[PDB]
Structures are given as C-alpha cells and as structure tokens.
Ligand binder design. Structure first.
Ligand SMILES: Nc1nc2c(ncn2[C@@H]2O[C@H](COP(=O)(O)OP(=O)(O)OP(=O)(O)O)[C@@H](O)[C@H]2O)c(=O)[nH]1
Ligand SMILES: Nc1nc2c(ncn2[C@@H]2O[C@H](COP(=O)(O)OP(=O)(O)OP(=O)(O)O)[C@@H](O)[C@H]2O)c(=O)[nH]1
Ligand SMILES: Nc1nc2c(ncn2[C@@H]2O[C@H](COP(=O)(O)OP(=O)(O)O)[C@@H](O)[C@H]2O)c(=O)[nH]1
Ligand SMILES: Nc1nc2c(ncn2[C@@H]2O[C@H](COP(=O)(O)OP(=O)(O)O)[C@@H](O)[C@H]2O)c(=O)[nH]1
Ligand SMILES: [Mg+2]
Ligand SMILES: [Mg+2]
Lengths: 49, 431, 426, 107, 41, 428, 426
C-alpha cells in the first residue's frame, strides 16, 4: 500500500523533486545510452606522435 | 610507495569517511568485503596474507550510534574493528567536554592506533583530518589530537578537511563558541586547512546538478571526490605529480594564514554534460566562477594570494597554460601585489570514477582548486562578531566553565583571533 | 550505554507513565506479556534506554512507581501493560497526601522517600552509564507535588552531573479541578527551579484545545491527553535510541537550549496532528510540519509565543527526509518572524534529524521551546497566591503539619524572582 | 590501566555491578562486536524484510548497504590452537602442514 | 504432601523425537558391536 | 558410591524428613511408590526387580507422628522397618529420653543402622535432623550420637538442629534440654548447622510472599538447603566438594564447628522472573542479615570461613569476580588469621522445584555456610535463660527423679561457659 | 628422537593434560579413536616421543592418570578426547585428600604410590631412550600437591640422570579457592626445589587477564584456560618432534636457562594470541610475535618482570622464518631495556627455531623466562602462611594425620632461603 500510494502520486511534485535523485533524465537523453558506461565531452584522436 | 593516513573525527568525520572510502574501494578493484577479484592501492590500503586489504584510516566518535551502523552494515568486513574507536557518551556541543574529561580518556588509544598504522608503512607523507568546526568532538577531540600528533611525529604534514559553519544557515546555537575555541588551538599547530561549508554545496547541488532537496550523502560524495582528486597525484602516474608535502608549502605564506577555499570544476549531471563542451579553457574558468565554490564568499572583493591547479584525465599542458594566461588578463580576477605569478599545476593520467547511484556524470577532464584568498577573512569577522554578540550577555558560558575550562580562555581565544583580522588586512594592502 | 531510569509519582504522573509505557512498548515491539514481536532488528539494538532484560528474554522496564494511596496503583498495574513492571518497584503508602504539599514532604513523604531511594539507587548503580532521570508528575495535588519534589531534591544531591528531566502538569488557567492548587504549585516550583535541568510544562486546557480543534473530537477522554503527552515525551529521546544523520541526546537538547542555569522551563509541541476528516487532504511534507510546529494553537502550554520572544528553539525531526528543506525552513521561520526572536542569539533554533519515524507515521517532529512568554503562566499563579494568602485562607492544613508561614513567602519570592529575571531578556 | 594492585575489578572483565553481558545478542552492549565475529553467529540465518519494514530503513541502508538475501553454509571443522582461534575462515579449505627448509631449498 | 502432578509438556517436536529414537537404535546396536599355514610352508 | 545415611529423630526430625525425601524423590525420577517410570545411590538403594528404597531411619518415641507417614502418600516408599516408633514419649524431658525411655530402644536403632550399613559400600556421613527443645530429639539423639561415635569412630556426622528461637518459643523447659544436649553434642558432632524457626518465619513473610505459613513452608526451605549440601555427591561439576572438604575448609579448631546456613534466591513466582538473577546479584544476598536463618547478625562478629555451594549454569569466572568484589566491602569483617576465607563449589544441576511449593524454578542457587563468631550471642541467650531459672531449681524434680544426677546441670553450664570464653579468644 | 613419559596428578592436572593430549594428537593428525588421518610424513616421523604403537596401527599416549578422587576418572574418559587413553593407566583411590597435604603425602597418598610407581616403571622401560618426565598439578590441592611431590621424590630416587619437568599451578594472589591454600603451597614448594630440574608457574588470574584483555572473551571456562596451558606445553617440545634449522630439546633449554641448581622457576607464555575480530587483519611477523611475547601482560604467572630482572630468557619459535631477524629482534629486546637484564651475563636470550608451525597458523613462538620477580610469588605465600600459623589455625587436620610442628617451620625456612637466594641478582 505504500508503493501503491507512491504510484498514485507520480503525476505530482515527485516528478521534479525526488528525495535523493535529481530528475528522470531518460526523456532528455537519447534512447538507451547506458549512462554508467559513457564518457561525456570531446576527446583527442592522438594522431601525430 | 607514498602512503596516507586518514583520521575521521565525529559524525561529520565518519559519514564523510563512509563516502570517501566507498569511492576509494570503487576506484581500485576493491569489493566492500575487502577482496580484490597493479600496485596503486598502497596509498590507502594495506595487504594481508589472506588476500585481504585493510584501509589506513581511523574513525573516532564518542557517540557510538554513528560507527554502530558502520559496524552493522555491509562494510563490516572491510574496516579493522580496532581502528573503529567509539566512546560511551558524546561531547554535546561543548569544547570542554571533548577537551577536558573524555577528551583525554581515549587519547592513549587513538595515538596507539596511529602509531601501529605508522609502523606498517615505509614512506609516510602526511595526515588527513576530517572533522567539523561547529561540532562537539570535531572541535574538541580533533583539535587536541592534532596538537598531540604535532609533537609525536613532527616533520609530516597535517592537512585538515574542515566543515566550516555556513553563513546564514546553521544547526547549533553554541557553534560560534566551539568554532572560535577550535580555531584558537589549530593556528599554531596545523599546517594548512582546506575547508568547505554546507550552504554552498546546497546551492551547487540545486543549480549545477538538477537535484533539489539533497541529503548529506549528496554532499559527502562531492567531498570524497575532491579529497580523492587531491591525493590522485600520489597513486596514479602523471606528467606533473604533486606530493603531499608540496601543497603544504606553496599555498601558505605565513603560518597564521593557512585557510584556503575548495572548488571542483566539472560538477554536472549527465543531461547538461551531454550537450556541453568540456574543454580545459571552459572548465578552468568555472573554477573562478563565484557560483562554483564550496565556501560562500565573493572573491572579487578579496585578493587571491596562492592557487593550486590539480588536473586529471586527458589534459595536455598548453591548454592549461594558455588557460591561466587568460586568467591574468581580466580585471575582475585580481591577485595580490607581493605575489607574482603564483599557480601550482599538477597533471594526472586518471579520469574520475563515478559511483553507481551517484549524481555526477562520467567525464574526461576534472579540476580541483585550492586557493588561498583574503576574502575568507570576512567569515572570521562574522564569526567573532557573533561571539561578541553572544559573549556580552554571558550566554551559555556556565556550560563551559563547570567542565574543566576557565573563563580566561575565552578571552585568550578571542584576543588570538582578533589578531587574525589585523593579519589578513595587512597582507592585502599595497606593499 | 546511555540509559534512563524513569520515575512516576502521583496518580496523574502514574497514568501518564502507564500511557508512556504503552507507547514505548508498541514502538519497540514489546508484547503485553513482555517478550519481543517487532518487525525489525533496529528496534532492539537500542533497548538499553528504557528496558532491562531479565532472565528468559523478558524486557522489564526501569520504572519507579511510587504513590501515597494504593487506590490508583492497582489501576496502574493496568490491563494491557501493567504486568511488564517488576513487582518490587511498586512502593505504596497508606494515607494519601490529600492535596497537601506538606503531607507529601514531611509526615507521609519522608518515611517513603527512604524506601524509594534504595530501589532508585539499586537501579541506578546497576547501569553501564546512566544518562538521567525523567519524573512524570503534577504540581497540583499532594503526593506528586510534594513527594516527587523531595525525590528530585534527594536525587540531585547524589548525582549532580546527570540530567534531571521533569514532565510537569501545571494547573490550567481556565478550569481547575481543585482549589488549593496555587499553594502546592508555588511550593513545588520553588525547588523545581534549583534542582532540575529541563522542565516541560503541560496544561490540560491546551490539550483539550488540541483534542477539539485539531483532531476534531467532541468528548475526549483522559487517555487521549495522556497519549498526546506520551507521544511528545517519547520524541525527545529518539536520536539517542535510533540511528540517524544528525543525532541529539538529552544533554544535546540542554547545552544548546538553556543559556542560563535558572531559565530552564520549556514548552513542547507535536507536529503531524490532523483529524480524521482531513486525513486524506493533507500531504505529509516538511513545510507542513514546520508550519504546524510554530502555530500557537498547536501547543501544550497555555501561553502563546505572540506575547514573548523565543530564547532558543529545539526541533527533533524524525523520518527519512532531506537536510536542505530543514535548513531553509528554519532560516525562513527566523527571517519572516524577526520581531519574535531575541537579537543577541544569532541562531536560535536547533535541528536534529533521526531516521526512524513513530508507529504508522512517515515523517514527524517534536518541538521544544524556551519562550519569554512562559512568565505569564507563573504570573497567573502568583496572582492567585497573592489573592489567596493574604486572608490566610487554607493555612490551617499546612501550619498544623510541621511548616511555618515563613516558608510560603520564600516560595513567593522565588516566583517573583523567576518572573522578574525573564522580562530583562525581552 | 594498572594504577595499583586493585586497579582491576573496576575497569572491565572482572566486574559485577553493571547491566552489561546480561542483555542478549542484537542489543549492542559491552562485547557485541566480538560476538558477531564468532563462528556461531555467522551461520545464523538472516530473514527477509517482511512487511512494515519500509518504516525502519535508514539513509545508510539506502545509500551504502546492499540489500540481498544471503545463503548460509557450514564450515569444515579445523583444529584450534588458542582460545578464540577461527582457522575455518580464510581461503584454503584444508591447511596443509608446511614443509621444512631442506625440502623447499634442496630439490 | 500429595501425589505430585507431573506437568510434562514436550519441549521437543514429535518428528524430531521419532528421528532421535530411530538414530539411537542403529547407533546403540553398532556401538555395542565395535566392543592356517605353517611357517615353513 | 557417595552414599549418606540419614537419621531423623523426633517430631521435628520426621516432619523435616518428609519434605526432604519428597524433594529427594522428585529431584531424581523416583515416584512415591518408589518406581522409576545412576546418581541416586547417595540416598536410594535398588532392589532386585525395580524399586528404590531410601537409606534413612525415622525414629520417634510416640506413634502419632510416624503412623502419619505410613498412612500417607509415601507409605510404600519407606521400608516398614526403618520407621521405628516407640510406645511412650519423653514428653519434653531430656532425662526421660536419655536415661529412662531411651536406654532400651537404642539397641533396635543401632541394629537398624548396622543393617543399613552392611548394604553400604562408600559411606561418607550421617545426616541427623532433630530439635533442641524436646525430649526425644534432645536426649535420644544425644544417646544415639554417643553410641554412634563409638561404634563407627572417625565416620563423619552432620547436624541440622532446630535451635530455640530468641523471642518466640514453644515449650517451657526448653533451655534445660537445649543446654544439656549442647553439652553432650559438643564432642560428638563434626559439624552442626543451627537453624531457628523465627528467622525462617521472617524469611517466609519477607522474601517469599506467603504469609501465615505452616511447618511445611519451613521444612521445604530446610530440605532445599540439605539438598544443596549433598549436591556434589551425585551430579558432575567444575568444582566437586565432598564431605571431607566440608570440615577441612570450615572449622579451624575442633571445638568450633557451628556454622550458619543461608540460601540466597528465595523468591515466589510473582517476583522471580522480573529479576536478572546472575550469581553476582544473588551472591551478595547471602550476606544480607535479613536472609540469615539463625536470628542473629554476622556483623556483630568476625567471619572465619565461608563455604559457597552453587547450582546450575554458574561460570567460575563470575563467582570468582563477585567473591573478589565481596572482600572490597567494609561492612563484612574477616578474622585476621584467615586471609582468603572462602571455599567454592559449583554443581551443574539446577535446583529442583516442587509443585505446590512456595519457591520458583530458577537457574542459579547459592548455599552459604559461614562460620562466624556471631554465634556466640546465641549461647549468651540460653545461658542467661538457664541461670535465671536454674537458681530457683524449677522443673528439676522430673530430671533428678528420672535417672539423672544433679551434677550434670552444673557440668553443662560450665561447658557452655567454656564455649562462650572459647569464642571470644578467637576474635582477637 | 627422545621419549617422554607424561604424568597427571589431581583434578587440575587431569583436566589440563586431557586438553594437552587433545592438542598433541590434534597437531599430529590423530583422531580420538587412535588412527592416523594426517597429510604429511613429518607427523608420523617422531610420534614415538608421546605415543606407543598398539595393534591395528593405532596409537596410545604415554601418560599416567593419577588422582585420589575416583569421580574424576569418569570426567576424563567421557570428555571430547577420552577414548585415546589406556584404561590400565587410570589409577584412583577411595576418597580425595580433602585439600590436605598431610594425608595426600603420608596417610592415603603413600599406599597408592606403589601402583603408580609400578605403572611408571612398567611404562618407562618400554621406550628406547627416555629423556625425562613431565608433571601437571596444582599447589593448592591435596592430591597434586601431596601425592605429586612424593611421586617426584620417588622417581628422582629411581631415575636420577633423567630430566624432570613440572607445570605447576601456583595459588593466585587475589582470587582463590581454598582457605588452606598456603599450607599446601609452602610445603609443596619446599619439596619442589631439591627434586626438579624445570618448574613452570601458572596462575589462574594471569590466564583470566589474558582471556579478558588479549583474546577478548567475555566468559572463559576452565577449558578456556587449560587450552592456553596446553598450547604452552606443546611449544617447548616442538624441536623434539619436528625438524628445524636450530633444534633444542628440554635438556638444552635447562642447560642454557638456569645458572644455579635452585633457581629453576620460570614464567611461560605464548606468542600469537589475538582477538576474534583482529586475526584476519593482523599479519603474523616476527616483530609482531616478539613485541607481545616480551609484553609483561602475556605470561601466565602473576609476577611482573618490571619489578625485577631477567636472569636468562628462552624463546622457542615455530614456523618458516628467517634466522637473521629473530636474532636481530632478540638483540632489539635485549639492548633497549638495559636495566631489565642482569649485567654480568653476556647473552640472556635463547633462540631456537622449529620449521613446522601449528597446522593452520603462519608462525608461533613460546616464551620461557627466569626472572628475579618470581620471588614475589613466594612472598605472598609466606605472608599468608605466617599470618595463619602464628594462631595455629587449621592445624589439627595436618597434625592429626601424623605430622609435627617443626616441618612447617623448616619448610618456611627453605622458602625464605629461596627468596633470599633470588635477591642477590636484583
Ligand atoms: N557537509 C556535511 N556536514 C556534516 C555532516 N555531518 C555532520 N555535519 C555537520 O556537523 C554539524 C553538527 O556537529 P557534529 O560535528 O556532527 O557533532 P559532533 O562533534 O560529531 O558530536 P555529536 O553530537 O556526538 O555527533 C552540523 O552543523 C553539520 O553541518 C556531513 O555528513 N556532511
Ligand atoms: N522448623 C520446624 N520445627 C519443628 C517442626 N516440628 C517440630 N518443630 C520444633 O520442635 C520443637 C520441639 O520438638 P517436638 O516437636 O516436641 O519433638 P521432640 O524433639 O521429639 O520432642 P517430643 O515430641 O516431646 O518427644 C518445637 O519447639 C518446634 O519448634 C517442623 O516441622 N519444622
Ligand atoms: N492530563 C491528565 N491530567 C490528569 C490525569 N489525572 C489527573 N490529572 C490532573 O491532575 C490534577 C490533580 O492532581 P493529581 O496529580 O491527580 O494529585 P496527586 O496525584 O495526589 O498529586 C487534576 O487537575 C487533573 O486535571 C490524567 O490522567 N491526565
Ligand atoms: N587452569 C585450571 N585450573 C583448575 C582446573 N580445575 C581446577 N583448577 C584449579 O585447581 C585448584 C584446586 O585443585 P584441586 O581440586 O584441589 O586438586 P586436587 O588436589 O586433586 O583436589 C583450584 O584453585 C582451581 O583454580 C582447570 O581445569 N584448569
Ligand atoms: Mg558523534
Ligand atoms: Mg514427640
């Protein structure tokens, strides 16, 4: 009943203010990105030693 | 084989220790039971003949119910039980309780444990202290622990990681008393004091990440991140290693002035980093943004005196130097005249490790700023103005005197710190 | 390792203690038969503070139950939770102190104080590290106001370094049950200001107000008031018996809370109180507990804080929550109310977040306030004493017992000194 | 510690005036850390969280503790030399006797 | 001084008692059971 | 084995022995019929087929108290020749039961003792239960002990004698018999545990909740004490204590063999299970003067030797710790020539609770045998009781008219005076 | 290879040596029946030191089980390792000595010596080259103190050229069992000096302090201390059974340990003693073993060597260790406390290294030390003897068994001469 109570109130301020998390970033991040194994930012190709 | 010994005092010590040691167990291949399924783990971990790794840290808190959950949790088999030191009753926001009755009861146990941890290492380079300025035992027991360690070891470096009281918000009432009484006995003993607060990390979590209403873990993870980045030059190879001894002697000009700030550059979530360019010239002026620093102060009124770059990841030097050469051109960021070009740069070849369930994004570049700044003198001015408000009406003094203290030590501490105000405003005038 | 020996004196304090060991036992999962049936191991990890484990896994409590009349001590060995107590802690008297401070102090409390001190010392010296005592009683009647005061005076002598917590029942302003209440009230508060460390005042008028306009009940019973009193009195020792992210024991709530040794009269509160008809229209959130805590109608002291200024504020939050809401709510409750706090204390409030909520609630709080406005409560009793004493109205039952007229005037002078040394800090 | 000849019978161990060691396990008084390290306590099973347990979970539980059912197994008995020796932990299930210096060196 | 009332409640299960007896029969029956050519040919 | 022959003489002896043998039957598996539905050889002897008969003898000179026990619950347990009953009682007269009515029945009791002793193999001691305020248990017990010390010599005998209470009393000629039999028993008893009845009345009213008690409520306590003495002769333990260990570590001199008995956990079922009954908090209940069973106070004198007998789950560490913290109390005084002053014994068997009794089932029990100079004040009372009433020569004519000469009164009084001056030169 | 005949006297001796034979068979890989269930060949190499060979390839210990009390012969066979003992080596009388040295030496301990001597003469002639004898007994009883000393005297008459060892259990200073303990203790130490070559003093209080402070056990039993004693006794005969780089038997220890024939009272100890919670975290190295082996709270006697001086010191090591760092650590522990060692000697420490550690441990070590602080053991016995003998207390038990008053005085004189002999080196 407590998880049911939390599920009835998902269209709430629980959207943009959870207890420990920030915001569900899956609607802002493309498809299945595997957030743990992803290195953001540009990298250098290390040609011309 | 450069090794570090950590000392975590109090509730703010033990919780930060849990976060940072989780990060250390994850940076190396260390499971929470202690098994590793390379020799870079020597700085923070020892070895045992059973293939077992034990951290080089002591947890001390007279209130037991902070170490009890550490003992009951899943990290039980990692920590040495004899390195987990608890008492029977807390210091209760009193310098005198943690400095004069059970402050001296457990000193011969903690110093024994530190000595045994020192005989098992060959090259020891310093001590990391984790305590809270406004607590009862982080202000009482740590402040005499470091004064005893200064006479027991000598030529090592004592660096403290202090939770300075936040400007507007605060927890306790007698926080100025304990803060002013623990900064009196650390000025002539400790070498340097990298210090943060809690309000600024709240603003950083609200703004730079998307997390509203965070817990203490969401701040302790950032604290563990910067503490790892400071020591990252020890256990990982790089172009320019920075040792534990060297950021003890190019940030502090005079032994009374050893209070820098703290800053982590790429504090950002997956969403905002996924659009962002993370060039060196873009994250090194995020360090100089007043919004991104873990002490609330405006450095534009203040005067920078020393800085320390700590870089990790894929970073080439001339991006760094062409970035600092841009720093010196703007009129807003202004140094002090008796200091010429005063940066210290260090490169590491290891990107930061993200923790599962964490909020930061796995990035390629990271910068840890430690900068002495004259603008930290405003915090001390507000703190001792707060005491002068409290001390006039003899508020809460009777809780201190009837606990082994003396009324004259309030005076001796306040006349000590009135000299810090006239110290900081003479190193900022035109020479 | 921070345990408390609990003391109950008088019929009112005895019924309050019975409800207290109702609430603590259904919080820690103790059956009426004394065993354990709780649903987690976090309840049993800190059973130190209130329970002694006898042989056989039975958790008897550290209750000292004493009274001068046995007519209520058979009702105190109550139905549900009267058999958990050990039978040797009941200390009876024959002739009850029939609304007499003097009888409860001199010719019927003195021969029983020596038979209750031995069991108190037996329980206290069998502790690993004692933390303090709670003494639930009243100041209106005879056996509580006299005998508990004598007990406090004797206990403060041999343990000067412990915590002397009292959960007092001050006579109501509007409707009182007896008439010789002012005499007992002033001769009890004379030795309350000098021998204790923290005093909580609980009125029955404010409790009736709470049970009427907040819980929306028409004809509340005494057990309802006792349950409210036990609920707030269980909320101040939570952080020392349940793990959390910011802990505070009883000394924590004394060092931060009293600036002077003789201004230690508090006034409590209980935040998540809502009626049955408004149960499902009120979200349980921090800005609601904070709003209700500082409401004047939410409190169990007759004085409202609109008249005075808070010296220091305590707020023991419970439940799994976030620190930033607590911090910004405490900052905004001071900034938006700048005319109702003293200017010579920078941070008046004090926060402490435990992690275990009470039974059935998710997030809760506990208010402990030291306001200047508590001086009106003693002003009323001083007014009634000055109106009553000048005609020597009921001195016949006091002076014919072993007291002089001079003892009343010193209590009146101490009342005037408590009141006069509260207006300076306004 | 040893202030005089009668310095003990007040510190710990020799003591008969406290409530320690009368509380059972899972109560956290006195010696409880060294009792959970005992081999009897390790083989005791751990029950699953069964109703109303969402009230009694802490931030340390939801942040660092890993909640997973644990299988319980027995240990093969091995010789003990001193009181409190627990050789039935550590990797090798059977500890072979060591060999002499001649056997290792001269081969 | 009356004939005493042995309030014998079982402290053990019926199945375990049956198993104990079943083991005991074989164990007792075995414990009670532990205790051609000349040299020049 | 480790057997012991019990001798019950007098009404007090047989009424104590009823409860004693009920506890002995119920401690083992012996039914009232004597059938088991080998640690019982101390008190019971097996027959060929299935029956265990006791090793006791029940002697009385009147038949209104032994015919009680052969028409009751345990009428089949006892051997119907071990119940020796007389025709006419001594009637509160030492002279009658020592010289007139006792000179001619003692041969039968001697024959029964011999026939119990030919079945005996490892005889260790004699348990003698009687009272000091009667004619049978004062005179015939004295004659029996005098004959037994000659027929058996060095074989030990113990004494459980109901001493006359200081305030309350039953009879009138109590001091005469209680001084004569004390003078006689002085040289023929290896140990003699004095018990009062007023002190056990106070124990029952105060420790237990049962008030208005009967003689049964005291006999159960005495049976529990005598069960704790011989507990180490039947059951295994960490520290076994036999009867040769008894007097070796208790009596320092052959004339001083009068110790005080104490049983520590005496609590009813309403209050027993709310306490943390460790050996620590019950071993200092032995030193409480309220729990003493002779109506005296050991703080009036010096402790000389203490024997601590333990039952149940007693760990030697915790009794050692509690005992070494007992010596750190300034209330208790020990004599100077006994620096250690303790003897301990631990039995693994918990005490056996009797249904219908007043005690509660517990896991731990202490029996204390403290030899104290405070027993000298027990001699002063009946000494003054005699010389205040002997000077008028009251009640003498039955004594001097029934086989007793006049010099025995003066001789017994002189012996008691020598005892009183004997207990005062030890305390210095 | 040197055979050893074991002797047990009294209840304490019988319960110590049962555990000793348990650990000896446990490190030789012998099941309780007697069969061999080992893993290596070294375990069956020198098993003739402690065992005979019976039919069917089984092994029986070379031990004699002596006590006056017949009840304790049941407690040995019914123990966890009772099947291995031969029933013909159990000797027993009717009645215990009753804590009386007099009848344990003259009355009932002098007609059963014939059977024990027949068993020993029967059994010590069944071996190849007997090295000597061992004895485990107590000084505070009547059997181990009376019959044991008479046994030592008779064997010393019969076999003068062998060695004699004794693991005595001396009376503890403050905890005690018997009121007549000094009477037996003085009169046994008087008989020990002329008849033994090696004597070890074991205090029960020292073992309890070990089990409290080092092993962190909250409720040790008597087997909990017999285990420590048995671990010590096995570590002094390690080079007799397992090979090594520097072997040393009992005679070589005696030669390099005691300088004058009366000063043979040592203080034993065992090195790798850790708590249950810190044995996965502590690496067994030689600087760890030798730091706590020379710690003054490790040894099993109630004598403090900081009060005295070390005449000679022995240290027998087991395990695969270096031969440079053991001698470095011995000079490390010999040079820095220069005031705790006698100056007129070259070398105090005796170092012997055995290759095979106990099966399961990494390395282990055993301590044997002659100290002038062993005289403090005899002052507390002599003081309690002269406090009780001057009032002639508890004397008729000893006098009535056929003893004179001058034996006590002459035994006290021998004790005082022994005390004054040790004071020359302090
Ligand atoms: N940033 C941060 N601050 C913390 C944390 N834990 C405690 N604090 C700070 O600690 C202050 C409270 O004082 P403490 O140091 O925890 O008290 P103490 O000295 O440990 O003494 P105790 O009451 O026994 O815990 C609060 O104002 C917090 O700002 C933490 O995990 N992170
Ligand atoms: N404690 C206790 N005392 C008893 C009991 N029965 C008798 N007495 C005591 O015995 C004393 C007198 O002894 P008697 O009952 O007359 O028995 P007796 O010694 O054989 O003397 P006679 O009956 O005259 O032959 C009385 O003072 C009682 O106190 C008993 O069952 N328990
Ligand atoms: N809240 C509450 N008040 C009570 C209770 N019982 C009595 N009182 C109050 O106590 C006052 C009487 O004083 P009381 O303490 O009972 O007299 P005493 O015990 O003899 O000292 C009355 O005004 C009642 O309002 C109770 O159960 N709950
Ligand atoms: N270490 C140890 N000491 C014991 C044990 N059993 C008895 N003792 C000690 O031995 C002493 C008494 O020995 P005792 O029974 O008199 O031996 P006896 O001569 O055969 O009677 C007591 O002080 C006990 O402390 C044991 O198993 N281990
Ligand atoms: Mg703390
Ligand atoms: Mg009769």
């Amino acid at each position: 009943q407590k998880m049911k109570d939390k599920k009835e109130s998902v269209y709430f301020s629980n959207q943009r203010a959870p207890l420990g998390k920030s915001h569900d970033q899956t609607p802002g991040l493309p498809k299945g990105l595997d957030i743990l194994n992803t290195t953001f930012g540009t990298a250098i190709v290390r040609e011309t030693s | 084989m450069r090794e570090c010994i950590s000392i975590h005092v109090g509730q703010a010590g033990v919780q930060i220790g849990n976060a940072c040691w989780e990060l250390y167990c994850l940076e190396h291949g260390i499971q929470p039971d202690g098994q590793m399924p390379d020799d870079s783990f020597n700085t923070f971990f020892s070895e045992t003949g059973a293939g077992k790794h034990v951290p080089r840290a002591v947890f001390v808190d007279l209130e037991p119910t902070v170490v009890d959950e550490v003992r009951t949790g899943t990290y039980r088999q990692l920590f040495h039980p004899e390195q987990l030191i608890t008492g029977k009753e807390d210091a209760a926001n009193n310098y005198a309780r943690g400095h004069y009755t059970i402050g001296k009861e457990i000193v011969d146990l903690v110093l024994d444990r530190i000595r045994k941890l020192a005989d098992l290492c060959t090259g020891l380079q310093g001590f990391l202290i984790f305590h809270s300025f406004g607590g009862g035992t982080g202000s009482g027991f740590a402040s005499l622990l470091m004064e005893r360690l200064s006479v027991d070891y000598g030529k090592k470096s004592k660096l403290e990681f202090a939770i300075y009281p936040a400007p507007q918000v605060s927890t306790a009432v007698v926080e100025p008393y304990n803060s002013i009484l623990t900064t009196h006995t650390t000025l002539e003993h400790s070498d340097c004091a990298f210090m943060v607060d809690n309000e600024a990390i709240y603003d950083i979590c609200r703004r730079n990440l998307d997390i509203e209403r965070p817990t203490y873990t969401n701040l302790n993870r950032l604290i563990g991140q910067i503490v790892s980045s400071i020591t990252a030059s020890l256990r990982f190879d790089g172009a320019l290693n920075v040792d534990l001894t060297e950021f003890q002697t190019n940030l502090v000009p005079y032994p009374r002035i050893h209070f820098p700030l703290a800053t982590y550059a790429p504090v950002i979530s997956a969403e905002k980093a996924y659009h962002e360019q993370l060039s060196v010239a873009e994250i090194t002026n995020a360090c100089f943004e007043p919004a991104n620093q873990m002490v609330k102060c405006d450095p534009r009124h203040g005067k920078y005196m020393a800085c320390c770059m700590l870089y990790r990841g894929d970073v080439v030097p001339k991006d760094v130097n062409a970035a600092i050469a841009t720093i010196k051109t703007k009129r807003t960021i202004q140094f002090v005249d008796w200091c010429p070009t005063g940066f210290k740069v260090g490169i590491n070849y290891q990107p930061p490790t993200v923790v599962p369930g964490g909020d930061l994004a796995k990035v390629q570049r990271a910068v840890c700023m430690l900068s002495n700044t004259t603008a930290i003198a405003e915090a001390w001015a507000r703190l001792d103005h707060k005491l002068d408000l409290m001390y006039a009406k003899r508020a809460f003094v009777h809780w201190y005197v009837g606990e082994g203290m003396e009324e004259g030590e309030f005076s001796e501490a306040r006349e000590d710190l009135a000299a810090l105000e006239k110290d900081y405003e003479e190193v900022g005038v035109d020479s | 390792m921070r345990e408390i020996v609990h003391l109950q004196a008088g019929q009112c304090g005895n019924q309050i203690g019975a409800k207290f060991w109702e609430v603590i036992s259904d919080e820690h999962g103790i059956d009426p038969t004394g065993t354990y049936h709780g649903d987690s191991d976090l309840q049993l990890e800190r059973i130190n503070v209130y329970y002694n484990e006898a042989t056989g896994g039975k958790y008897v409590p550290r209750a000292v139950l004493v009274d001068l009349e046995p007519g209520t001590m058979d009702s105190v060995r109550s139905g549900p939770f009267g058999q958990i107590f050990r039978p040797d802690n009941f200390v009876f008297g024959q002739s009850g102190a029939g609304n007499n401070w003097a009888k409860g102090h001199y010719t019927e409390g003195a021969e029983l104080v020596d038979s209750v001190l031995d069991v108190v010392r037996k329980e206290a010296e069998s502790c690993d590290c004692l933390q303090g005592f709670q003494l639930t009683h009243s100041l209106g009647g005879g056996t509580g106001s006299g005998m508990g005061t004598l007990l406090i005076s004797k206990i403060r002598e041999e343990y000067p370094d412990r915590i002397m917590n009292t959960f007092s029942v001050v006579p109501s302003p509007k409707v009182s049950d007896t008439v010789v209440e002012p005499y007992n009230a002033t001769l009890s508060v004379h030795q309350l200001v000098e021998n204790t460390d923290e005093t909580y005042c609980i009125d029955n008028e404010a409790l009736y107000d709470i049970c009427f306009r907040t819980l929306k009940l028409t004809t509340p019973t005494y057990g309802d008031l006792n349950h409210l009193v036990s609920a707030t009195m269980s909320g101040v020792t939570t952080c020392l018996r349940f793990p959390g992210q910011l802990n505070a024991d009883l000394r924590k709530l004394a060092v931060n809370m009293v600036p002077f040794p003789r201004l230690h009269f508090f006034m409590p509160g209980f935040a998540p109180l809502t009626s049955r008809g408004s149960q499902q229209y009120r979200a349980l959130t921090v800005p609601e507990l904070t709003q209700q805590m500082f409401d004047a109608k939410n409190m169990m002291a007759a004085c409202d804080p609109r008249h005075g200024r808070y010296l220091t504020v305590a707020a023991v939050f419970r439940g799994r929550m976030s620190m930033k809401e607590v911090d910004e709510q405490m900052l905004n409750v001071q900034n938006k109310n700048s005319s109702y706090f003293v200017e010579w204390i920078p941070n008046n409030v004090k926060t402490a977040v435990c992690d275990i909520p009470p039974r059935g609630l998710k997030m809760s709080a506990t208010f402990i306030g030291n306001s200047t406005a508590i001086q009106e409560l003693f002003k009323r009793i001083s007014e009634q004493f000055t109106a009553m004493f000048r005609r020597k109205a009921f001195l016949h039952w006091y002076t014919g017992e072993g007291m002089d007229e001079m003892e009343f005037t010193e209590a009146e002078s101490n009342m005037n000194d408590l009141v006069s040394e509260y207006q300076q800090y306004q | 510690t040893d202030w005089n000849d009668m310095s003990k019978f007040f510190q710990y161990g020799w003591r008969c005036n406290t409530n320690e060691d009368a509380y059972s396990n899972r109560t956290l008084m006195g010696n409880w850390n060294q009792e959970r390290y005992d081999l009897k306590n390790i083989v005791q099973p751990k029950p699953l969280p069964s109703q109303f347990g969402h009230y009694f979970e802490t931030t340390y539980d939801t942040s660092y503790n890993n909640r997973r059912p644990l299988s319980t197994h027995r240990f093969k008995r091995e010789p003990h030399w001193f009181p409190g020796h627990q050789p039935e932990l550590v990797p090798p299930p059977y500890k072979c006797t060591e060999k002499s210096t001649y056997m290792t060196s001269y081969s | 001084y009356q004939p005493p009332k042995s309030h014998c409640q079982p402290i053990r299960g019926k199945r375990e008692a049956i198993l104990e007896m079943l083991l005991r029969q074989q164990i007792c029956k075995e414990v009670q059971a532990e205790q051609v050519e000349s040299v020049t040919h």
